[PDB]
Amino acid sequence: SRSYPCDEKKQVIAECSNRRLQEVPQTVGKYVTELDLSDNFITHITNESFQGLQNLTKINLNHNPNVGLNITDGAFLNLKNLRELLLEDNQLPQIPSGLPESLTELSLIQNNIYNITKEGISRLINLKNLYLAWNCYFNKVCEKTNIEDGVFETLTNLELLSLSFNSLSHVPPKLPSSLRKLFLSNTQIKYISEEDFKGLINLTLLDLSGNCPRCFNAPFPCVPCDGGASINIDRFAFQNLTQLRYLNLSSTSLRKINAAWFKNMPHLKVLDLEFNYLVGEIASGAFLTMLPRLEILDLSFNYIKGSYPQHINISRNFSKLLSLRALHLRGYVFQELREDDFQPLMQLPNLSTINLGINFIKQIDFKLFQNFSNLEIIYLSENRISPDFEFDPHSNFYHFTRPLIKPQCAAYGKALDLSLNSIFFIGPNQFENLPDIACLNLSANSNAQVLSGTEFSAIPHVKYLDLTNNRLDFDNASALTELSDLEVLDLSYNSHYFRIAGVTHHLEFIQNFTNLKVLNLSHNNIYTLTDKYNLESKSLVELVFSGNRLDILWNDDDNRYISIFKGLKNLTRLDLSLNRLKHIPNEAFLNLPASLTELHINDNMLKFFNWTLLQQFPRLELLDLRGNKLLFLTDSLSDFTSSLRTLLLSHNRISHLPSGFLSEVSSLKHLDLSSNLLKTINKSALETKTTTKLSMLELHGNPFECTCDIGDFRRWMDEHLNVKIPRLVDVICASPGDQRGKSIVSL
């Protein structure tokens, strides 16, 4: 029997999120142990809410009611297997009372709890992770957090405690010595004493960020300490923190770093000192001598307001950071990087990542990077180089954690990211004295030049090149041909010249690469080319041609572009989306590479599609026709293809499934008919001539008529439990009026 309303999967989880549920489903499968109820409309939780679910080990009740939750005393107490309970964003006025002893994980993030009591927490002695963060913060109308004395001290198995984004004003005493990770960010703690961490000898992480914050240009309501003072850390505060691997002192207004802080911290691996006032400490820094095992150092955004110094002043003591792998120096702000300035970094054996983003750097002596031992990521993006809540409580608050360079680019080798600069022209010597760059990002440099096949000769082994978002003038057939190992080329958003009919446009250079694999020409507004109308490549596997004008290129009165993709003999993935196509001429379609396995023509305006032409494409496995205006399906698809496995047809105008459709089909595993105009599916369309190979049928968003007519399909839904129908709660009757909004499986 099909699980409803939750999608149950035996990885036994009952994903039942965002299903407009107004209460705990009394139709949940018995063998469920993990129940996700997030983003619904649950307003009440009673001791009868989870009655026939005693086997439950995990409940997620986050964001209920979605867009305030009431939980009776002891509602969860009859669940002896409950290990993880997530009550985030539930506007809880108090910690739920009578929580079960079995809990190992409890999160009350983003509520209105201002009182952490013994009666709520102290019995929960099996707790390992406790998240009480984000209850009182910013300009929210909320109270100072009251933490009863000794509340955490009985929790002798507690490994993680998060109390960040609450007003504590003091580190709570009597913390359990089991603590491994202590999150106290943005807690309004201004003073750290010798006693505050005295017992925490197993502590591997300490986050004291956002205490006495640096509020200038803060993108959130930020209240500094008096006179913008620094956090006051006692000389001996970290004395017993011998196991510390992570320390976050971001935005604590530090001007001085006491080297004695790290005297007994020999395992310190990651040190976050963003958003402080440490330009002076960066230039002298006795503390750097205390971190021989440090791998990550973040000193981003320590700039002096109003300043634009000529050079970055890096202390020679940086040469002591022998284990350093990554240095983040965003937002120091300085005009020029000379080779001399980075001498202290050049003997560090493992320094692979240097991040100098957002420094308004105008000039760089690029040869310096060659003098490092093993740079892998040279990040210079965003400089001036010339020729219900907006903060995710579970993300870093001071920096995006996304990787610096796309992993697909980085995987090829050394990466040089010069995106968002002003290299509007690459001259004859731009890339001299560089390391062997394999991954090069020149995105958004306002480059309008005519690449001529000589500009990258100093770095001929570039394999992934990102030239997106420029204004490149493709007016030379030898462009980029010096890059004989080029595999991935991204030219998206270079529409500036393409859009102008009157200038010449030349793409013939595509053919000269022997190992070009992926070409992105998206959003170039290509509608006209000069002399050579065909794209050709023996190697190319993937062409993204979205956001261009195939409607014009293939207009009925023009034969010139009828074979535009035919010369891509090796092509298997082709993206023709967003080309304003109302139809594709038969000859044009039949001239698509016969080697295609994946074809996207979604988000056009297709009103017509010749299914017969699929005969020409015996390797086609996926056809994406979503977001068009099709009103018609063939009833003889099988005569046209025996290779198609996925057919995406959502968001069209299909109002009728033909007789003998599903069994015809036969090769399809996945058919997506959601968001069309189906009011019914006749017995004839189901038929069951042959045994289907279909494993997923999407049907939500269709205006189903829930009368006698819908019975044949409901009976079809029952027999074929091997055909997954996603979003049953959204597979809804649009009519008659008395049922409008009701899911069809409920009938």
Ligand X SMILES: *[C@@H]1O[C@H](CO)[C@@H](O[C@@H]2O[C@H](CO)[C@@H](O[C@@H]3O[C@H](CO)[C@@H](O)[C@H](O[C@H]4O[C@H](CO)[C@@H](O)[C@H](O)[C@@H]4O)[C@@H]3O)[C@H](O)[C@H]2NC(C)=O)[C@H](O)[C@H]1NC(C)=O
Ligand Y SMILES: *[C@@H]1O[C@H](CO)[C@@H](O[C@@H]2O[C@H](CO)[C@@H](O[C@@H]3O[C@H](CO)[C@@H](O)[C@H](O)[C@@H]3O)[C@H](O)[C@H]2NC(C)=O)[C@H](O)[C@H]1NC(C)=O
Ligand Z SMILES: *[C@@H]1O[C@H](CO)[C@@H](O[C@@H]2O[C@H](CO)[C@@H](O)[C@H](O)[C@H]2NC(C)=O)[C@H](O)[C@H]1NC(C)=O
Ligand U SMILES: *[C@@H]1O[C@H](CO)[C@@H](O)[C@H](O)[C@H]1NC(C)=O
Q: Quickly list DSSP for 471-511.
A: ------TTTTTT-TT--EEE--S-HHHHT-TTS----GGGG
641: left (phi over 0), alpha (psi -120 to 50) or beta: beta
Among 353, 443, 481, 494, binds ligand Z (CB under 6 A): 443
Which one of the spans 357-365, 487-495, 633-641, 709-717 is the region binding ligand Y (CB under 6 A)? 487-495
Site string for ligand C09, 338-377 (x = CB under 6 A): --------------------x-x-----------------
Among 268, 326, 405, 576, interactor with ligand Z by CB under 6 A: 405
206/333 with CB nearer ligand X: 206
CA distance 261 to 238: 6
**x-or-dash string of contact with ligand X, 118-157, rule CB under 6 A:** ----------------------------------------
Site string for a copy of itself, 655-694 (x = CB under 8 A): ------------------------xx--------------
612 binds, among ligand C09, ligand U, ligand Y, none (CB under 5 to 8 A by kind): ligand U
In this structure, the number of other CB atoms found within 10 A of the CB of residue 408 comes to 11
Asked if 16 and 6 count as a contact pair (C-beta separation under 8 A), the reply is yes
* Closest C-alpha among 80, 100, 83, 35 to residue 62: 35
Compute the residue count for the chain: 747
- Please tell me the chain's helix, strand, coil percentages from 3-state DSSP, rounded to the nearest 5: 15, 15, 70
The Cα–Cα gap between 700 and 78 comes to 37
Please report, for residues 429, 471, 503, 525, the alpha-carbon distance to residue 550 in angstroms, rounded to integers and kept in the order given: 38, 21, 19, 9
Check residue 504 for interaction with ligand C09 (CB under 6 A): yes
For tokens 């990077």, name the residue: 369
Say how far residue 218 (Cα) sits from the centre of its chain: 24
Cβ-closest position to ligand U: 452
Q: Is position 520 an interface residue for ligand Y (rule: CB under 6 A)?
A: yes
* Nearest residue to ligand X, scored by beta-carbon proximity: 248
Query: Is residue 272 at the binding interface for ligand X, with CB under 6 A as the rule?
Result: yes
Please enumerate in sequence order all residues whose Cβ is within 8 A of that of 532, keeping only pairs 6 or more positions apart, or say none: 506, 507, 508
Query: What is the footprint of a copy of itself within residues 311-340 (CB under 8 A)?
Result: 330-331
Close Cβ partners of 554 (under 8 Å, ≥ 6 residues apart):
561, 562, 564, 581, 584, 585, 588
Q: Across-strand partners of 364?
A: 337
**Segment interacting with ligand Y (CB under 6 A) among 247-255, 325-333, 471-479, 486-494:** 486-494
445 contributes a contact to ligand Z by CB under 6 A: no
b/e sequence 391-407, b meaning 16+ C-beta within 10 Å: eebeeebbbeeeebbbe
Residue 491 C-beta: closest distance to ligand Y, Å: 9
Q: Are 77 and 103 in contact (CB under 8 A)?
A: no
Residue 560 binds which one of ligand Y, ligand Z, a copy of itself, none, with CB within 5 to 8 A depending on kind?
a copy of itself
Q: Does residue 204 bind ligand C09 (CB under 6 A)? A: no
Binding track over 308-327 against ligand C09, x by CB under 6 A: x-------------------
- Distance of alpha carbon 352 from its chain centroid, rounded? 24
Interaction partner, residue 518 (ligand Y, ligand U, ligand X, none; CB < 5-8 Å by kind)? ligand Y
Instruction: Choose the binding region for a copy of itself from 262-270, 288-296, 550-558, 587-595 (rule: CB under 8 A).
Output: 550-558
User: With binding defined as CB under 6 A, does residue 270 bind ligand X?
Assistant: yes
**Smallest separation, CB 490 to ligand Y (Å):** 5
* Three-class DSSP category at 536: strand
Residue 84: strand, helix, or coil: strand
- Per-residue contact string for residues 177-206; x = within reach of ligand X by CB under 6 A: ----x---x-------------------x-
The dihedrals phi and psi of 586, each to the nearest 5 degrees, come to -50, -45
DSSP 549-583: -HHHHT-TT--TTTTTTTEETT--EEE-TTS--S-
Q: Are 340 and 313 in contact (CB under 8 A)?
A: no
Label each residue of 679-695 as H, E or C: CCCCHHHHCCCCCCCCC
Query: Measured from the CB of residue 367, what is the shortest distance to a copy of itself in angstroms?
Result: 26
Q: Are 440 and 468 in contact (CB under 8 A)?
A: no
Which of positions 469-508 make contact with ligand U (CB under 6 A)? 476-478
Q: Does 490 bind ligand Y (CB under 6 A)?
A: yes
Backbone angles phi, psi at 441, to 5 degrees: -110, 110
C-alpha separations of 708 from 58, 61, 231, 676, 747 in Å: 40, 37, 72, 21, 11
Q: How far is the CB of 164 from ligand X (least distance, A)?
A: 6
Interaction of residue 279 with ligand Z, rule CB under 6 A: no
Least distance (Å) from ligand U to the CB of residue 622?
15
450 sits near ligand C09 (criterion: CB under 6 A): yes
Residue 394 interacting with ligand X (CB under 6 A): yes
Question: What are 439's strand-pairing partners?
Answer: 415, 464
Q: How far is the CB of 178 from ligand U (least distance, A)?
A: 30
Our CB check for ligand Z shows the closer of 437 and 644 to be: 437
Which segments within 577-736 are labelled E, that is strand?
A: 598-600, 622-624, 646-648, 670-672, 696-698, 704-705, 733-735
What span, in angstroms and rounded, lies between the C-alpha atoms of 564 and 130? Answer: 60
376 binds ligand Z (CB under 6 A): no
* CB of 182 or CB of 489, closer to ligand Z: 489
| Per-residue contact string for residues 120-159; x = within reach of a copy of itself by CB under 8 A | -----------------xxxx-------------------
Q: Mark 504-523 with x for binding to a copy of itself (rule: CB under 8 A) and - for no binding.
A: x-------------------
Residues in contact with ligand C09 by CB under 6 A are 301, 303, 308, 331, 333, 358, 360, 450, 473, 475, 497, 502-504
What does the binding site for ligand Y look like in residue numbers (CB under 6 A)? 406, 408, 468, 488, 490, 492, 518, 520, 522, 542, 544
Q: Which residues bind a copy of itself (CB under 8 A)?
A: 67, 137-140, 216-217, 219-221, 301, 330-331, 358, 382, 384, 388-390, 420, 422, 424, 446, 448, 471, 496, 500-504, 527-528, 530, 551-552, 555-560, 582, 607, 679-680, 703, 705, 707, 709, 734-737, 740
Which spans of this chain sit near ligand Z (rule: CB under 6 A)?
A: 381, 405-406, 409, 417, 419-420, 441, 443, 466, 469
Q: Which residues bind ligand X (CB under 6 A)?
A: 164, 181, 185, 205, 207, 209, 246, 248, 270, 272, 392, 394-398
